[model samples]
Target: AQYEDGKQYTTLEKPVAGAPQVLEFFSFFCPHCYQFEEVLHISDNVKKKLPEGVKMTKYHVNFMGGDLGKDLTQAWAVAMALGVEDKVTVPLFEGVQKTQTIRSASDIRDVFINAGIKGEEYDAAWNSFVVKSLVAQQEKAAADVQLRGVPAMFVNGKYQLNPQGMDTSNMDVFVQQYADTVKYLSEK
Candidate 1:
């Protein structure tokens, strides 16, 4: 109710219905997304400052890696389904973006195994109905949001954040402002 439309955010024509959650559209291959996650730790830093019960969700964008984008997103869903995101997210990005090592699903699997996820366990999640459902949902959300760039955040699936609105000269200041805007928009 308080944020400026077309400045901090723009309202969606039809809002996504759910409890308050900030949906982030990101790509493992995108340098900025990787930087934001590990160097900036935006998700980790912001989650601590969010309002009660508000959460941040990640959707791997499909515009990069071509067909591999689909595979990469499925990897994220599998990690989420297996509860290994905390362990796998960083490594997955490192392999895909940092070192430029990952190309096939097998490459993706090694990144998981390095994180201590078992081959069978990975298979279980990979083939799981829940994982499949979540993968579809993640893909659909990516498509529905019509992402213009990586590292985009939408609060309550309606308030699309504008990155230019935040001060980026000093990231120490930036992350706090980022959290504040997200917290404010989550309530609207």
Candidate 2:
């Protein structure tokens, strides 16, 4: 148990409580996260392997793309609030990494509208202090984690996953090892 400290993962300053709560911090603008969303498919695969009573929560990082990053997160949060994540996540990735259609908040607004969300609803969530506060928390959490890159993940807020320990040369080995580490740490 102790051996994994600083090797597999470092302990959080304050462990978040749950049976096992996985938080994945990523950005739609990140090509790597786009890989995870499409090529690597890390989040979905990990979710499938998670035991009952535990699930991964996504936290969009606002540290990338300047104001654009922050607004992207706000768009993500709005998607959550509206329960339309499926409609937003992939297209946002496409807009960012694939087609390069998104550049500003207004561009993001176009996405939300295209996702079938009413423009009025978009304004409602966009202007709400509650949603902004959630975005603020996400901004701070990204800063709190002090991430050097995209897709920084943690289990129960106690252990941040370290890719160095996994075998990435072989995709099969890499996926299994990564998911197993997440499961093992959650049980710990």
Best by lDDT: 1
lDDT of 1 by residue, 84-160 (tens): 88998888888888787998989998999888999999988888899889888887886677667888888887888
Error of 1 at 68 (Å): 2.0
Expressed as tens digits, the lDDT of each residue in 1-188 for candidate 2 is: 53376666667776555413888889987877898777877887788788888867788987789989888999888877778887888889999889999988999999989879999999999888878887877776666666667887888767888877666798777777777778888788
lDDT of 1 at 54: 78
Cα lDDT for residue 185, candidate 2: 80
The clash number for model 1 is: 0
Structural similarity to truth (TM-score) of each candidate: 0.91, 0.88
* Candidate 1's TM-score: 0.91
Alpha-carbon RMSD to native, per candidate: 2.0, 2.5
